[PDB]
Amino acid sequence: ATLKDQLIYNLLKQTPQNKITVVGVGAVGMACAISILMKDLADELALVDVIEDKLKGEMMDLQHGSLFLRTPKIVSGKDYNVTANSKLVIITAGARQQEGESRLNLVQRNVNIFKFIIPNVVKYSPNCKLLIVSNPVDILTYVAWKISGFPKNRVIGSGCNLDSARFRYLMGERLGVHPLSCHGWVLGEHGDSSVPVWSGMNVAGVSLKTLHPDLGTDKDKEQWKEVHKQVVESAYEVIKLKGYTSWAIGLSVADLAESIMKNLRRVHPVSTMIKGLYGIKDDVFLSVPCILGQNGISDLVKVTLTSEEEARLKKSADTLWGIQKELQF
Amino acid sequence: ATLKDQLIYNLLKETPQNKITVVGVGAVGMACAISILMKDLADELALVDVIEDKLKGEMMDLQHGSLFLRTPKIVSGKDYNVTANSKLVIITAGARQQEGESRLNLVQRNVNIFKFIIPNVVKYSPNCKLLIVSNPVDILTYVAWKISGFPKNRVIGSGCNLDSARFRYLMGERLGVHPLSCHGWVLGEHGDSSVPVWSGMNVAGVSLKTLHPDLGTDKDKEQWKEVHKQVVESAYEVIKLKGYTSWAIGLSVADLAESIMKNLRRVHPVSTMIKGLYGIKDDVFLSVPCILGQNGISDLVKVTLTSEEEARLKKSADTLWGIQKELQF
Amino acid sequence: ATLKDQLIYNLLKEEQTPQNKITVVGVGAVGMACAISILMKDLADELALVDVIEDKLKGEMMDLQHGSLFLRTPKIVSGKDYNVTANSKLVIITAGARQQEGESRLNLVQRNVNIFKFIIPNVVKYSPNCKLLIVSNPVDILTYVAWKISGFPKNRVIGSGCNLDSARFRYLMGERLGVHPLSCHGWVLGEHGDSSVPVWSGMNVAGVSLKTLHPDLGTDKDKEQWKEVHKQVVESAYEVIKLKGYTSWAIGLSVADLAESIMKNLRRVHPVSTMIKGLYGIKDDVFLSVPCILGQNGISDLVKVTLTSEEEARLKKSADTLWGIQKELQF
Amino acid sequence: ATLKDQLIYNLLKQTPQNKITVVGVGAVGMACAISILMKDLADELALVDVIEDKLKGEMMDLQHGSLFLRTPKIVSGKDYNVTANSKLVIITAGARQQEGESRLNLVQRNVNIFKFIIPNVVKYSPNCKLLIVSNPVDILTYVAWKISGFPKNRVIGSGCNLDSARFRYLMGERLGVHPLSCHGWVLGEHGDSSVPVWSGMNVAGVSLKTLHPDLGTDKDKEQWKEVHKQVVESAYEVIKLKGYTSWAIGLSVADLAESIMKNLRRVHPVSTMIKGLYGIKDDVFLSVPCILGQNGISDLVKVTLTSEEEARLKKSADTLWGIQKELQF
Ligand SMILES: Cc1nc2ccc(NC(=O)CCNC(=O)CCCc3ccc(CC(C(=O)O)C(=O)O)cc3)cc2s1
Ligand SMILES: Cc1nc2ccc(NC(=O)CCNC(=O)CCCc3ccc(CC(C(=O)O)C(=O)O)cc3)cc2s1
Ligand SMILES: Cc1nc2ccc(NC(=O)CCNC(=O)CCCc3ccc(CC(C(=O)O)C(=O)O)cc3)cc2s1
Ligand SMILES: Cc1nc2ccc(NC(=O)CCNC(=O)CCCc3ccc(CC(C(=O)O)C(=O)O)cc3)cc2s1
């Protein structure tokens, strides 16, 4: 007999139970992959792309690391049959912006890619949650929704989770407190029109605006408004410095994956439909704080905004709705 | 008063306890960084390189994900003062081989680079453990030892930890067993002359050489010798496919870092001086299984080797000493 | 509207079935050590506890619930009714009598068989596709009993077996050699009890056979008395019971170890109780510990460990002992 | 040669680097121990008690599970020399209250115990942080402080970290949100006079009191005041039901240990001196939100309280001072 058979007696004779697929093995895709692998979120990871050498190479490189992981199956392919029965499918494919390019300028390029990807994802994993990372993520989350046919709870855009993480990091550097204990939301577009929620910023429940009423105004002698400018400009400052971003967005997406896979019902600011709220009457998607778990977005927190904060959100919605008029599928 | 002072009353005006430094922010050094950040091994991470924009960009990308990590200080710098008081300094700087180029051919380019790097690391963290990853890692570990002036125990080459992981991966695929439960050691050079210890290969304490005497010979109908050949050619196969390797060596390095930082006294196959063993009489460094903890390599396991397995290790020693003795520093 | 409705707009008021649910039956020290271990290893999205003493139970559930801020397992439930265990992937049975200082595990048979006659059919009614992980003693025999009562195929009925004995062996090996038990390999097989068999021929660090370096290893003439290491494995539960009254932490971690391989489908190799009819000359439905490959379908394969003639002799003895007691069963 | 010498060649034959001592091996001590071992916060764990057989037995039980942990050294003893060079020493020793007995009634018994324990801890780890868990914790932190001669940043009482955790769990049940995303602080005494800071209660930065002004009053149709009553009654109801409490406090204390050992500078409600705040003029210790890291309590968050919230806290302060002022040691 073979060595395998001399050594091993087989009793039997199985479908993956916590499978994650990542589409796109660019830097963002592979940061998402590694982060998820190291947080033990998946019993199977699947990677898909269109460049076959790059794809196989990536798969093999993670495979070689299996001894150090707790994810026992890693697969890849151009064919989406390798994505079958995923619980979560993370879409990181597409064009990405140059220095001085708006994320909104990526829309026709990435919409066209999504018309191929999304029906194939849906084909093999019709009960998955779809986490859109590709940009402009707010429009692409709407597009993925209309393409997939999924109910809106299962279509989630990474949105402002990373913007809020950035905001909280900067808030932490200013206050001398870990970002975990710093609270504050950047909502709306993941992009130039994002809205800092000054009214909700706090440490230990203590409202920062309550202690410092100029917070968020141009008069402000500490210039806190510049912390939001830095959040808006981060992706560009980093692209200018290393040519792309990868690690933070990967971590931000693993953070969201963790809340979905383990059904935590944590609150995250993610892209979803906000028609009906804040005076918006159109099918705009943008980020508001949502309750994330095993059915995706089960609930929305209806954050209370000052009139200035609400006017900015509405302007973000109007901007996104304008670009949404360009959509053909 | 400022918002900080209104909010926070300070008791203490007053150095990191568990600091790690990664030198080199190429794919390998950033995979080392992310893996370490996600295993919570450090209370501070320092990054160093010569390219200032890329360095800053990398640091910032990591920093923006701090909400999702438990490492409160991330710093970078061309200047090695950012690395002061590190427990562990991981060197990933250097030239990397092209397709069809042996790692051995990188020796003088990377020795040159080490003549700058090593005294600067040593300057600012004289009590650190030096984990060498740059290639040829066996000879470079020897070079790191001579330049630094550290005792043997605090200069550790990543060595064949990765090769053995690859081996165990390929063993697991054949056997339908997780690599954690597959045992087998690849020793000597991290390179073309690496020695597979067929005599040690087992699952659950069962000697596969005893079950299958053809194991590790070219006549073997199952062709187990090809498993080692796939280990030798792994890096080149992945380089051919994706241009470089990163994730497996990252994970392998965070595996070593874990044992050093937590003083685990686990056994890894890593590059150390083997003078005195198997009839090697010069200051040759290569991989044997070593006990790793907070003082680095505290002990070597004297692996018992068939006369051929020993002949192959003496051959790897010779190749290395050949290159090693023609170096000036 | 209410505060909840002012703050929160709901998309779904519609629950899924549990996806990664684990039940633990029995909330004694062992049961709760399993529970806390599982909770801090993030193996479950839902933990159900069952026992027959209602105040003890509610209080344990509440104590865990109070730590939820520090855990990542969102749903923790309890009840005497087995309807709280519905749709479990893995049901861990820790229920029953435990041995006094000086009492054999084999003396718990009749008491715990009767208990299982109530427990097992209840568990099967609400989770007919779960894996059963028997921890209660004598674990080899109670795994057989769980198997016969449940009607499950034998891949889904796993005894905690000698996973802990082997973990103790490795720890002691580690103290003698100066090496982490992770890097010490050695297998104790057969009964989780006095007739367990230390496999000297497979003991190794780094694939270096200790038996090969030290030919007397595991013999009485052994000047280093390695045989005493197995004796300490055998006596461990007893020295611990003698000192603190019971054991909990080590068995809790051992079970969590097994749960991890099952829930994440690792196909790692563990010495657990399973049926070994057809191996080593055993021809009856004996259950005992051999190295098994553990994954999402329970035990998918068995490693056929090669044993010296003495080591096989002792295992066949261990098997005969347990087959003996298996004759004590009436259903 | 022995088997160990044939197998292992020793290079090198050091102090404890990340050592935690737990004093008291009752249910709370051991729940602290297991929690810390499973979070990898220590490279050495020491246990201390007076009942020598229980102590030995608990050590052994932990030791036998070593294969499944990453904490390589576990030691115990009646003699405090096993605790030497601890970074963090956690005091869980003492009498505990009966069902229907106030933690304040434990004071004399546990003060007398501390007179033996505290100088013994200080002798062998003069630079440690002291985390007092024994009850009444606020008073015993003050006592530890006076006995030890430590600066006040290095003497931390577990205080209301558990109370706030219970609060957040209960809050989370009512709202359908994970406690991580529910925020609200219980301050003052760890016991009957604790103060719920209704003004700081929020999800996603949204003030619950702004939305629902009867929050925290007896009129309240939704009876939110009962959430606090349940926090206060928690240890009593758990004691009644299972006879003691262990798991929630163990986790809470590891949460604290985590912030100290990893130098995270998160904010926790923990016992410290608050003389000079909220019009308290005595050396009262009680819980307020403090920044926790490697020097213990570096900073205090000066929470903004309603006049009633402040009234309640001054009332908490008075109750404890009424006991503190009587003590002599
Ligand atoms: C028919 C077809 N099927 C496929 C299948 C696969 C692929 N594969 C690729 O396209 C791989 C290459 N593409 C990328 O990696 C795009 C990454 C986008 C990105 C970059 C940065 C950030 C975060 C960042 C910011 O938001 O700007 C910040 O804020 O930091 C977010 C998102 C192509 C096709 S075509
Ligand atoms: C004076 C100076 N100071 C500095 C300071 C920093 C830098 N920085 C850099 O040099 C960054 C760029 N260089 C790299 O990243 C080299 C990576 C080497 C590598 C690649 C792959 C593998 C694993 C692999 C295999 O072994 O081949 C397998 O087997 O998978 C191992 C090692 C330059 C200088 S110059
Ligand atoms: C109809 C009914 N339904 C129920 C439902 C629940 C309960 N609940 C309880 O019975 C709770 C109390 N029972 C225990 O906790 C027994 C634990 C057994 C144990 C002890 C130690 C070790 C490890 C040890 C060794 O193996 O000896 C070593 O080696 O360290 C393993 C196993 C009763 C009933 S009655
Ligand atoms: C000279 C001497 N040296 C020593 C050395 C060791 C020992 N050893 C013991 O005394 C061990 C037994 N003691 C305990 O375990 C006391 C636990 C205290 C406790 C219980 C519950 C909660 C949380 C709880 C609540 O606050 O009520 C809630 O809110 O849940 C907090 C604290 C005695 C002596 S005498």
Report the CATH number at residue D153. 3.40.50.720
Residue of minimum CA distance from atom 32 in ligand 3: C136
Distance CA D48, CA D81 (A): 10
DSSP character for B188? Answer: B
What's the reported resolution, in angstroms, to a tenth?
Answer: 2.4
Nearest to A61 among B6, B65, B238 (CB): B238
Q: Method used for this model? A: X-ray
**Contact between residue C201 and residue C188 where contact means Cβ atoms under 8 Å apart:** no
Give residue D40's domain range: 14-159
Cβ–Cβ of B183/C185 closer than 8 Å?
yes
Regarding whether A129 and A58 lie in a shared domain, the answer is yes
3-state secondary structure of D320: helix
Residue of minimum CA distance from atom 28 in ligand 4: D235
Indicate the burial class of D184 (C-beta count within 10 angstroms; 0-12, 13-18, 19 or more): buried
The percent of chain A in helix, strand and coil, each rounded to the nearest 5, is 45, 20, 35
Spell out the residues 6+ positions from residue A147 whose beta carbon is closer than 8 angstroms to its own.
A114, A115, A118, A119, A122, A329
Contact with chain A for residue B203, Cβ under 8 A: yes
Q: Which amino acid is at D151?
A: P
Q: Is residue D219 part of a domain?
A: yes
Determine which one of D183, D190, D228, D268 is catalytic: D190
Q: Is residue C4 part of a domain?
A: no
Contact with chain B for residue D127, Cβ under 8 A: no
Domain end call among B159, B180, B202: B159
Q: Which two tokens stand for residue D199?
A: 């003004």
Measuring CA to CA, which residue among D148, D19, D38, D139 is closest to residue D85?
D19
Give the neighbours of chain D: at least 3 Cβ pairs within 8 Å.
Answer: A, B, C
Q: Which amino acid is at C128?
A: P
What DSSP element (H or E) covers B237?
helix B225-242
Regarding whether A292 and A215 lie in a shared domain, the answer is yes
Q: Which amino acid is at D62?
A: L
The percent of chain D in helix, strand and coil, each rounded to the nearest 5, is 45, 20, 35
Distance CA B34, CA B250 (A): 8
Distance CA B124, CA A113 (A): 50
Cβ–Cβ of D202/A205 closer than 8 Å?
yes
Distance CA A55, CA A34 (A): 14
Cβ atoms within 10 Å, residue C84: 18
Measuring CA to CA, which residue among B218, B200, B224 is closest to residue B288?
B200
Measuring CA to CA, which residue among C295, C65, B111, A321 is closest to residue D230?
C65
Length of chain D: 329
User: Cα dihedral sign for C41, C43, C47, C49?
Assistant: negative
- With the most atoms of ligand 1 within 8 angstroms of its CB, the residue from A48, A169, A249, A270 to mutate is A249
Q: Is residue D231 part of a domain?
A: yes
Cβ–Cβ of D211/A178 closer than 8 Å?
no
**Contact between residue A168 and residue A269 where contact means Cβ atoms under 8 Å apart:** no
Residue B254: closest CA among chain A residues belongs to which residue?
A68
Regarding whether D237 and D152 lie in a shared domain, the answer is no
Angle, alpha carbons A276-A281-A283 (nearest 5°): 90
Distance CA B48, CA B124 (A): 13
Q: For position D238, which CATH number holds?
A: 3.90.110.10
A251 pocket-lining for ligand 1 (C-beta < 6 Å): no
Cα distance from B44 to chain D (closest Cα, Å)? 9
DSSP character for C85? Answer: G
Cβ–Cβ of D300/B152 closer than 8 Å?
no
Regarding whether A277 and A247 lie in a shared domain, the answer is yes
Q: Is residue A5 part of a domain?
A: no
Look at chain C and report how many structural domains it folds into.
Answer: 2
Q: Is residue B6 part of a domain?
A: no
User: Cα dihedral sign for B44, A240, B92, B39?
Assistant: positive
Residue A290: closest CA among chain D residues belongs to which residue?
D204
User: Any idea which residue has 């709705």 for tokens?
Assistant: A321
Q: How many angstroms does the Cα of residue D71 sit away from the middle of ligand 3?
A: 28
DSSP assignment of C34-70, as one string?
Answer: HHHHHHTTT--SEEEEE-S-HHHHHHHHHHHHTTGGG
Q: Is residue D5 part of a domain?
A: no
Check the annotation: does C84 bind a ligand: no
Q: Which two tokens stand for residue B173?
A: 């695929």
Contact with chain A for residue D183, Cβ under 8 A: yes
User: Any idea which residue has 């994954």 for tokens?
Assistant: C295
Regarding whether A306 and A197 lie in a shared domain, the answer is yes
Regarding whether B137 and B86 lie in a shared domain, the answer is yes
Question: Residue D95: what are its φ and ψ, rounded to 5°?
Answer: -70, 150
Cβ atoms within 10 Å, residue D13: 6
Distance CA A134, CA A159 (A): 10
Instruction: Spell B303-327 as b/e; 16+ CB within 10 A means b.
Output: bbbeeebbebbbebbebbbebbeee
Residue C238: closest CA among chain D residues belongs to which residue?
D57
Q: Which two tokens stand for residue B146?
A: 């001579």
Q: Which two tokens stand for residue B217?
A: 């010979």
Distance CA A229, CA A222 (A): 14
What DSSP element (H or E) covers A9?
strand A8-10
Alpha helices, H only, C127-204: 139-150, 163-177
Question: Residue D304: what are its φ and ψ, rounded to 5°?
Answer: -75, 115
Question: Residue A152: what are its φ and ψ, rounded to 5°?
Answer: -70, -20
Residues of A known to be catalytic: 190
Distance CA C278, CA C70 (A): 48
- With the most atoms of ligand 1 within 8 angstroms of its CB, the residue from A105, A135, A194 to mutate is A135
Q: Is residue B3 part of a domain?
A: no
Residue D146 CA from chain centroid, whole number? 18
What DSSP element (H or E) covers C322?
helix C309-326
> Which residue in B12, B45, B154 has the most chain D C-beta atoms within 10 A of its own C-beta, making it the best mutation to test that interface?
B12
DSSP character for A20? Answer: E
Contact with chain D for residue A180, Cβ under 8 A: yes
Spell out the residues 6+ positions from residue A216 whose beta carbon is closer than 8 angstroms to its own.
A196, A198, A209, A224, A225
**Contact between residue B159 and residue B169 where contact means Cβ atoms under 8 Å apart:** no
Angle, alpha carbons B96-B39-C89 (nearest 5°): 120
Domain end call among C146, C161, C176: C161
From chain A, pick out residues whose CB is under 8 angstroms from the CB of B245. 61
Cβ–Cβ of C250/D62 closer than 8 Å?
yes
Using CB distances shorter than 6 Å, the residues near ligand 3 are C 25-26, 28, 30-31, 51-52, 94-96, 98, 105, 115, 118-119, 135-137, 164, 237, 247, 250-251
Give CA separation, B240 vs B29, B107, B243, C150, D208, in Å: 20, 22, 6, 54, 58
Cβ–Cβ of A64/B169 closer than 8 Å?
yes
Regarding whether D79 and D28 lie in a shared domain, the answer is yes
| C273 bridge partner residues | C159, C289
Cα distance from D182 to chain A (closest Cα, Å)? 9
**Contact between residue A291 and residue A298 where contact means Cβ atoms under 8 Å apart:** yes
**Contact between residue C118 and residue C252 where contact means Cβ atoms under 8 Å apart:** no
Q: How many angstroms does the Cα of residue C157 sit away from the middle of ligand 3?
A: 17
Check the annotation: does C98 bind a ligand: yes
Distance CA C265, CA C19 (A): 14
Instruction: Spell D66-76 as b/e; 16+ CB within 10 A means b.
Output: bbbbbbbebbb
CA gyration radius, chain A = 21
The β-bridge relationship of strands A73-76 and A88-91 is: unpaired
Measuring CA to CA, which residue among D126, D116, D1 is closest to residue D48?
D116
Residue A12: closest CA among chain C residues belongs to which residue?
C300
Question: Residue B212: what are its φ and ψ, rounded to 5°?
Answer: -145, 80
Contact with chain B for residue C308, Cβ under 8 A: no
Residue D4: closest CA among chain B residues belongs to which residue?
B301
From chain D, pick out residues whose CB is under 8 angstroms from the CB of C253. 65, 68-69
Using CB distances shorter than 6 Å, the residues near ligand 4 are D 23-24, 26, 28-29, 49-50, 92-94, 96, 103, 113, 116-117, 133-135, 162, 235, 245, 248-249
Contact with chain B for residue A229, Cβ under 8 A: no
Q: Which two tokens stand for residue C198?
A: 């230390």
Residue D13: closest CA among chain B residues belongs to which residue?
B298
Regarding whether B176 and B149 lie in a shared domain, the answer is no
| D88 bridge partner residues | D20, D129
Cβ–Cβ of B204/C186 closer than 8 Å?
no
Q: Which two tokens stand for residue A173?
A: 């550097």
Q: Is residue D4 part of a domain?
A: no
Distance CA D165, CA D293 (A): 19
Length of chain C: 331
Regarding whether B180 and B312 lie in a shared domain, the answer is yes
Domain end call among D108, D137, D159: D159
Regarding whether D310 and D181 lie in a shared domain, the answer is yes
The β-bridge relationship of strands B186-187 and B195-196 is: antiparallel
Cα distance from C11 to chain B (closest Cα, Å)? 27
Cα distance from C204 to chain B (closest Cα, Å)? 7
User: Any idea which residue has 């790897």 for tokens?
Assistant: B316
Q: How many angstroms does the Cα of residue C26 sit away from the middle of ligand 3?
A: 6
Question: Residue C139: what are its φ and ψ, rounded to 5°?
Answer: -65, -30
DSSP assignment of B242-260, as one string?
Answer: HSS--HHHHHHHHHHHHHH
From chain A, pick out residues whose CB is under 8 angstroms from the CB of D176. 265, 291, 299
Cα distance from D43 to chain B (closest Cα, Å)? 6
Nearest to B12 among D8, D40, D295 (CB): D295
3-state secondary structure of B324: helix
**Contact between residue B76 and residue B56 where contact means Cβ atoms under 8 Å apart:** yes
User: Cα dihedral sign for A318, A322, A323, A329?
Assistant: positive
Contact with chain B for residue D202, Cβ under 8 A: no
Regarding whether D200 and D147 lie in a shared domain, the answer is no
3-state secondary structure of C274: strand
Cα distance from D198 to chain A (closest Cα, Å)? 9
Regarding whether C169 and C151 lie in a shared domain, the answer is no
